[PDB]
Symmetry: C2
Subunit: 549 residues, 2 copies
């Protein structure tokens, strides 16, 4: 049914009519204990959601909305393996990817636990050979660089996760990632690499993906030109499900690591898609990574809604989006290693919840999925916080930070801690965003009167602070799972299908159709519209093709 027509929804509209313009200064004045009580401690995460424009009543009303949407039933249905991906009629079981070996799960006649660990064991064995040097190139050398080839779910994860756990790379092998069909990507990434010490991971479920196979074939030519035709088998492995395409790409079929239809691309990093990560950090650390997801899964499934982190956060997001009209949310990890985290969340969130259709197929009556964007902390601070502070836009913000640093350096006087410098910003920014600074408060500073107005900080800019104990594989897994389940709760509330992605098909087929137009001999026929018609013609002349056109 339409969530927008329920009493819970109306109750929230009326509530917003009352507190929608209330300032965080007043929220805190009225609610002294919120700083301690509107928090959730789970796993290695301390989650403080108190700097939000909510009362205890808001939270209860939001939770009411969740219950009328049957969040808990749908949640159980996902874990159990019912086909909640309605438009495609399939299960949604990324959560199964991180289940302990001893877990019990049979779905549609498949024992997924056994299938999952079978692949993980095979990855562990292959990867061990690489890290030990039992696996060698076509000439005698050990592999020192793994280069992943994929797009979307097959790239954003592997890259973010490699950068995030950089400190845990312990086998002297590094990784690179080639995703764009722009040939500049492949050419730049292979420039300084020795083919004899380089091994390729070609990641695609069908093994027919246009960019990936195009990139992979060019890489194969590079490898073969150097090492010969038979060398393919020890410089190429596949994360795929298609045994007959992998061979006969030249890849040995037992160097093919699979994953299933019930794991979506944007949910795939904890599957065989994480092969490159396991390569650089090892099967054990990889297992700690999976364990971190599981902690949050366990918490999502068992905790009451009132104390359920991903649910509360998802609901608070919806509060701003549907009732304040905030079009976007910004994620700001205070960690250079997490610099690709916001880009990862972009696919997770926007490809999941960027929908206009309910699961049944009826049109939505309200906004669905927010724009997600950000940059790591103390870079973003100097780039766009000006707008966060003094802009005209409501942008709920997630601050993510780590208490303990992995490595540290002294300040400029040769004492103290650069990490403490980092984190002083982490705490101050949310404080300043929330409460701001008045004209009177600025005037008391001694600022010239006519300058005061330009310095005024209106505040009321809300944030969640997530303070993890330390950046570890488990903690990374905890963070990803945390967001996966927020995405789930917002989706269920809106009644959309957040596990399909039909919106990308047409772009692919239309590109295939336009290719001969920009490539073929002789002038193109009139196109569908005068804009692409003019653009295609200019493209032809500019590529040196329209002499005679």
């Amino acid at each position: 049914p339409d969530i927008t027509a329920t009493p819970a929804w109306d109750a929230l509209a009326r509530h917003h009519d009352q507190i929608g313009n209330t300032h965080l200064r007043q929220f805190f004045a009225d609610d002294p204990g919120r700083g301690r009580e509107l928090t959730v401690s789970v796993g290695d995460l301390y989650i403080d959601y108190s700097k939000h424009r909510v009362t205890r009543e808001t939270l209860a009303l939001l939770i009411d909305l969740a219950r009328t949407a049957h969040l808990e039933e749908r949640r159980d249905q996902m874990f159990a393996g019912v086909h909640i991906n309605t438009s495609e009629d399939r299960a949604v079981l990324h959560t199964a990817l991180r289940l302990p070996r001893d877990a019990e799960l049979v779905v549609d006649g498949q024992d997924v636990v056994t299938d999952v660990h079978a692949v993980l064991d095979a990855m562990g064995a292959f990867t061990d050979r690489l890290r030990s040097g039992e696996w060698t190139g076509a000439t005698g050398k050990r592999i020192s660089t793994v280069v992943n080839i994929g797009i979307g779910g097959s790239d954003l994860g592997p890259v973010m996760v490699y950068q995030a756990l950089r400190h845990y790379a312990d086998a002297g092998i590094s990784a690179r990632f080639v995703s764009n069909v722009d040939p500049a990507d492949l050419i730049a990434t292979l420039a300084d690499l020795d083919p004899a010490t380089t091994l390729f991971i070609v990641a695609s479920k069908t093994f027919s993906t246009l960019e990936t196979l195009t990139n992979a074939t060019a890489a194969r030519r590079w490898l073969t030109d150097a090492l010969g035709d038979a060398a393919v088998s020890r410089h190429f492995v596949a994360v795929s499900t298609n045994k007959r395409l992998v061979d006969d790409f030249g890849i040995n079929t037992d160097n093919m690591f699979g994953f299933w239809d019930w794991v979506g691309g944007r949910y795939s990093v904890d599957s065989a898609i994480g092969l490159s990560l396991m390569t650089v950090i090892g099967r054990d650390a990889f297992a700690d990574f999976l364990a971190g997801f599981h902690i949050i899964d366990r918490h999502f499934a068992t905790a009451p809604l009132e104390s359920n982190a991903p649910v509360l956060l998802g609901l608070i997001g919806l509060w701003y989006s549907n009732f304040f009209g905030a079009q976007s949310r910004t994620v700001l990890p205070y960690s250079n290693d997490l610099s690709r985290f916001p880009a990862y969340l972009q696919q997770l969130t926007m490809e999941s919840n960027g929908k206009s259709t309910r699961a049944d197929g009826s049109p939505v009556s309200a906004d669905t999925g927010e724009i997600f964007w950000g940059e790591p902390g103390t870079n973003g601070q100097h780039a766009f916080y000006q707008l966060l502070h003094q802009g005209t836009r409501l942008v709920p913000a997630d601050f993510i930070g780590f208490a303990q640093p992995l490595d540290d350096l002294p300040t400029a006087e040769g004492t103290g801690s650069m990490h403490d410098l980092l984190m002083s910003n982490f705490f101050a920014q949310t404080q300043v965003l929330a409460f701001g600074k008045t004209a009177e408060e600025i005037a008391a500073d001694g600022t010239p009167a006519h300058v005061v107005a330009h310095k005024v900080m209106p505040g009321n800019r809300p944030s969640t602070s997530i303070l993890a104990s330390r950046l570890t594989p488990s903690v990374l897994g905890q963070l990803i799972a945390l967001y996966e389940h927020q995405v789930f709760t917002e989706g269920v509330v809106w009644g959309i299908d957040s596990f399909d992605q039909w919106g990308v098909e047409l772009g692919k087929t239309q590109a295939k159709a336009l290719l001969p137009v920009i490539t073929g001999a002789g002038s193109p026929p009139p196109q569908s519209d005068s804009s692409t018609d003019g653009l295609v013609r200019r493209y032809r002349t500019e590529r040196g093709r329209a002499g005679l056109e």
Copy 2:
């Protein structure tokens, strides 16, 4: 005066009441020639703005708004060097940075043309020595890596620009960039570097910037531990204005390259801040870079508003933001080398126009500056276009592309062009975003009826396509200038000061104040609010400091 109260503004509101729900399919049906006529060819740029929700009447009304805001007067006033940065009472003369040697410009008693080229010559001379090997390290070797240290305007430019013009690096020296105060940044970037062949560029106008000087001092310790104390002078240079801090950092004062108060950080890359770029591509290519800005400057200053690219684009942006309520704009360069372009534009646009105050100091009556975000094309496509296509958000989109590739590879059959593959997407995506696909059109495809609704592409998602001839230093300069002037036109219309950034000060001073709280002996006093109070305490325990607390 308040732009929102003028007849031009009201005329636009009434116009929006009429065409605000009109679909691009109808816009094009009614206006067959728009594909050719709503374009501007300038420099090496072909700019097609026809896929926008505008009629010829919209454009005239938007241009009327511009004139009532005195865009052209303010524009001339900027070039001339009047103090349009009202809150700080200073000139805004980044445009002077790319003036030919023979140009005539005296402002406030300063001959800026002479001052500009003096610095450029000095950079040319220093940089030539590096590229030729006349400049050597403290041991006898040539410099093979330059590492820039800065934040904000002193980082985003140098990084984006190095990656964009990667193909033009021709002297065998590479570059790296260290911006975060998170020590992980410095530690990761220096890990595999030989101090004897490494040279540092420390970029900051005051040379007192907290992150930068902290990073720089740690780097100095790394360099000195290896090469000795006197080695500083040939491994450190400064882009700064403070001769007495540069020395006595240990840097030779004639290895200090300056820039002026009238160039803002987010407008500084074509100044001495571009030193690292000049190092890898040479003073000549650097001059072509500046020339590209100048072409667009010349065009901005002379072209009539009806055919003035940055003005039309700025106005169209405002149309969506102020009259459709679009909170963000996405920039999607189909080029892996331009992968950091969207992040660069984030600072340019949001730090400029994220304001709530007019130049006089009065409060704005409408939204000011949009959220800018994006990722390079064929990555973003697989990450978030799902939402662009089937989402619920209006996100005007800028597609940027290049006709000629720098280097190319064949497709998977060993013929054709990967670059043409890239560009087929470039043309198809805008086409699909604009016009979409109906239920009837999908049903005719053979799709099962109950699946049809999930595949529907509502379209009406607008875009500008910018097709540059080729990615060159000049073309990069043209693109940056193009955006600088859009930012200018939107700012002038809103009547804000887009060249100050007061909103960042408080965050800095509050971080300085919170530092002793998280660092000092003994438990912190009650903080300003219960959230930072709880967070600081958790931080202490987690860093191993609250034994006894």
